[PDB]
Design a protein around this ligand. Structure first.
Ligand SMILES: COc1cc2c(cc1OC)-c1c(OC)c(OC)cc3c1[C@H](C2)N(C)CC3
Ligand SMILES: COc1cc2c(cc1OC)-c1c(OC)c(OC)cc3c1[C@H](C2)N(C)CC3
Lengths: 184, 183
């Protein structure tokens, strides 16, 4: 599928260069021309919105596939979701780097933000109950996501480069994130 | 001059391509051959180290300048330090982009690390008194550094794009960092 080829190529390019990644590079790496890229995505912004939804679906399905239903404590459930997030990023570091660039972008439309939330409603509701009010507000929700993604990517980076201590980085990063973002 | 032209060209190149920026491009952006860069610097690792101290001195000076330690409260002093760091990164995005990568680059020697600490000894003392002891340990200080830098860089990024709310981002970033890292 050439649409999937373009999305995979856009993941790799945006992980490397951010949203500044060139659509000519992306198309060529997908094995297609820049013109047919724009026949799939009429604008670069449309490519960016669709890719963010594609990657959001990917990590949502992966984390839904691991959801431990025994966990009934709110902080332990958040630790499990954090662990699942770090694992996804360690397993797919390009996807995580790309999604971190996309999530903190002003190019995401309101329909995209709504569709991203609806892909994992149990998680959206869980965060509404446990995250500090300011980081669910209309004005500071994206910044709260940016702070989460920054602590998570740092945690992945140190876990990946020093795997003998990966569990420690992940638990220290979790505890740091929990008091940065969560209701005490 | 020639050493500084290499240092500033290395700052722009490492900001644009990361620490793996080629010595040829850096040398070329200063009008000198690649072999002259290896004359001024023994290895790439050594130039990475030297650039780190040059950029560390640049922000330490900028922060010691606005440093008022007539303030006694630990939290409010950390807030003003945080604000100065954000201010420096906003004013010099390329210098901050370069230093942020070197700080987590794992190629910095420990003479370099301690020489960086000596450029601002009161900050090191303030940090030891107020940062969670796990993050001031030798095992996890780099990680604690990385977390601080990631939070601060996100704060800078939102403040730059949204100047009307910039200080709110700065205030919220500080409070999250403070909860994440301080005792
Ligand atoms: C502002 O606070 C928070 C914001 C978010 C998350 C957690 C927070 O604090 C617990 C969070 C999360 O939850 C662990 C999780 O789990 C799979 C996944 C993700 C996120 C963030 C948004 N983004 C949606 C990337 C994916
Ligand atoms: C692990 O905890 C911390 C680590 C650091 C800082 C603060 C921390 O907690 C408050 C910190 C700081 O202090 C505000 C500051 O101010 C001029 C400047 C800087 C840093 C970090 C290291 N790096 C040295 C970049 C520069």
């Amino acid at each position: 599928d050439k649409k999937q080829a373009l999305l995979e190529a856009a993941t790799q390019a945006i992980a490397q260069s951010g949203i500044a990644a060139s659509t000519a590079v992306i198309a060529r790496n997908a094995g297609v021309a820049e013109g047919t890229l724009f026949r799939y995505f009429a604008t670069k912004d449309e490519l960016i919105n669709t890719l963010y939804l594609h990657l959001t679906q990917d990590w949502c399905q992966s984390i839904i596939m691991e959801l431990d239903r025994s966990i009934t404590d709110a902080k332990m459930m958040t630790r499990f979701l954090w662990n699942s997030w770090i694992s996804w990023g360690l397993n797919h570091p390009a996807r995580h780097r790309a999604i971190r660039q996309l999530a903190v972008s002003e190019k995401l439309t309101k329909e995209t933000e709504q569709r991203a939330d609806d892909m994992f409603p149990e998680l959206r509701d869980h965060l509404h109950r446990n995250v500090l009010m300011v980081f669910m507000s209309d004005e500071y929700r994206a910044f709260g996501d940016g702070l989460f993604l920054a602590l998570a990517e740092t945690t992945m980076d140190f876990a990946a480069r020093d795997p003998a201590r990966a569990g420690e980085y992940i638990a220290l990063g979790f505890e740091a994130m929990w008091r940065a973002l969560a209701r005490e």
